[PDB]
Amino acid sequence: MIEWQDLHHSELSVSQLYALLQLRCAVFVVEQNCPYQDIDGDDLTGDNRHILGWKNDELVAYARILKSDDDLEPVVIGRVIVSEALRGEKVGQQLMSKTLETCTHHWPDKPVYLGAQAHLQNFYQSFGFIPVTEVYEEDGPHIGMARE
Amino acid sequence: IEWQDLHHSELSVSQLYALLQLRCAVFVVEQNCPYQDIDGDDLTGDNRHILGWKNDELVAYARILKSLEPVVIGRVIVSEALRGEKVGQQLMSKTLETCTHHWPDKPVYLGAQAHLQNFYQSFGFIPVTEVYEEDIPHIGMARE
């Protein structure tokens, strides 16, 4: 019984912001062994939204949506997370479809781009994405994908 | 150089993003360490954050943790643009003045390394620990 929140960045409280960067750090920095700049600015600007999956005051799912650069290019999905205690069990499919329902609602008549791993390709292709890119590397494999 | 001294309840959404952003930019990308900087110590108890501002850009940072056990200093940062000229010595000057004000006659502990030993030692800190590696030579000093 995960509650979902589709937050424009202006609605984020201090504890809501803390929870999603801490979970982003825990997954993309710590567990994925990648010292990088996870906190890049793109979170509190423009019409950008965040989607949070909560399981009893625990943030167990997250994705952010970039609408930029206030230019022609598509909707960007990124930072897609399920917390490791809860994986292999339909929640990732729930996060994605609700995040596309957000892309669909807010900006219909705009496709959705998404940067991904190579090994995650068949899971995003089950949501309507197709590779728009050659396989390349950020840690030892990425493909660029887009929907509609 | 505007300085702020905020109990964690006074952090706005923008002040919270900025100090984590600089902390990630110093302790994880620059020092090449993939650790959990956002560690759950920032928004609890009487813990406070000391900020130094210059043109809508956080350039000096330190953190103060509470709880029967001593007051702790950590996360000490001078952004690279401003390093090497007096910004660090005076950050911990607010930061020890801040301890001395809320917790008067209460001993400051500072987790540090070693290379900068003489730096922190210039403010009253004393080795309490033996050197060990962490995430990287370390030592735990203390003041008063």
User: Could you write out the three-class secondary structure of B83-143?
Assistant: CCCCHHHHHHHHHHHHHHHHCCCCCEEEEECCCCHHHHHCCCCEECCCCEECCCEEEEEEE
HSE toward the beta carbon, residue B55, CA cutoff 13 A: 2
- Quick one: which H or E segment has residue A143? strand A142-147
Q: Residue A106 contacts by C-beta under 8 Å, 6 or more apart in sequence?
A: A47, A49, A65, A67
3-state SS, one letter per residue, for A103-133: HHHHCCCCCEEEEEECCCHHHHHHHCEEECC
Burial of residue B108 (CB within 10 Å: 0-12, 13-18, 19+) is buried
CA B96 to chain centre: 10
Contacts of B77 in chain A (CB under 8 A): none
Q: Which of A75, A73, A83 is nearest to A28 (CA)?
A: A83
Q: Which of B142, B68, B64 is nearest to B110 (CA)?
A: B142
Which residue in chain B has the smallest CA separation from A22?
B38
Pairing of strands B71-78, B108-112: parallel
∠ CA A41-A60-A70 to the nearest 5 degrees?
30
Method: X-ray
Contacts of A29 in chain B (CB under 8 A): 24, 28, 34-36
Answer yes or no: do A30 and B36 touch at CB < 8 A: yes
Among candidates A25, A35, A41 on the partner chain, residue whose Cβ is nearest the Cβ of B36? A25
Beta-carbon neighbour count of residue A54 at 10 Å?
A: 17
Tokens 């001993």 sit on residue: B107
Beta bridge partners of B48: B7, B64
Answer yes or no: do A44 and B16 touch at CB < 8 A: no
Residue type, A100: L
Residue type, A142: H
CATH of the domain at A124: 3.40.630.30
Pairing of strands A112-117, A75-82: parallel
CA A43 to chain centre: 12
Expressed as residue numbers, the domain containing B133 is 1-144
Maximum distance among all Cα pairs of chain A, rounded to whole angstroms: 40
The answer to whether B61 and B50 have CB atoms below 8 angstroms apart is yes
Pairing of strands A59-67, A49-54: antiparallel
Total domains in chain A come to 1
- Quick one: which H or E segment has residue B77? strand B71-78
Which residue in chain A has the smallest CA separation from B21?
A39
Residue type, B26: V
> Smallest CA–CA separation between B128 and chain A, in Å?
30
Cα dihedral sign, A45-B37-B64-B122: negative
> Smallest CA–CA separation between B49 and chain A, in Å?
14
Answer yes or no: do A29 and B36 touch at CB < 8 A: yes
Task: For residues B61 and B17, give the distance between their C-alpha atoms in angstroms, rounded to a whole number.
Answer: 13
Q: What's the first-to-final CA gap in chain B, in angstroms?
A: 29
